[PDB]
Write a protein that binds this ligand. Structure first.
Ligand SMILES: [Zn+2]
Lengths: 114, 113
């Protein structure tokens, strides 16, 4: 599923070098989210298998699913004015449960509003 | 970021002798007058940046030390005049480096090491 691949591209970074504004400004472009500037985007860290398992045993219904375990995350939030690149961001490192959408056994969307 | 871009100019060269040093020290603006000692870090720039984060660790006062070692070239001035033309000899090295960071970016290299 290229959707799951795309989920990992947009919402997964296993061992982040940092968790600050510059990490975000780097990651948002690296991961294809700056044409144009995506307003809010969370990267989940840690082991990939725990995220995928939100679709099963590490999840409960929430058409969405909420994680039964917490995750190191970094939320990138646009700043600077209008959403023309180059995209400025600030970062909020977090440790919490997350909500995702699963389809046919795999994560395909991350729910930022949660 | 001026401080970060100055760090790269003065202390970073991605891809190792006296002539290396003599041209590099000049090309990177460290020869008016002659800087006595200056080290270039070689290798992957992300690895160096990461010293401020995952790949480094707190050191002394307000500094940080690399967790892995880096190939380095230290240029040492030769001759009696502190003015250019600046001649240098090279010490190729392999070791941990100490830097200072500001906002997750390298801004200073510690030559006493
Ligand atoms: Zn000298």
């Amino acid at each position: 599923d290229p959707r799951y691949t795309k989920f990992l591209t947009q919402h997964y970074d296993a061992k982040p070098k940092g968790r600050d504004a510059r990490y975000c400004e780097s990651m948002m472009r690296r991961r294809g989210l700056t044409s144009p500037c995506k307003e809010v985007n969370t990267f989940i860290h840690g082991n990939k298998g725990s995220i995928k398992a939100i679709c099963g045993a590490n999840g409960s219904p929430y058409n969405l699913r909420i994680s039964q375990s917490p995750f190191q995350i970094t939320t990138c939030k646009h700043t600077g004015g209008s959403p023309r690149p180059p995209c400025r961001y600030r970062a909020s490192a977090g440790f919490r449960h997350v909500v995702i959408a699963c389809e046919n056994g795999l994560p395909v969307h991350f729910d930022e509003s949660f």
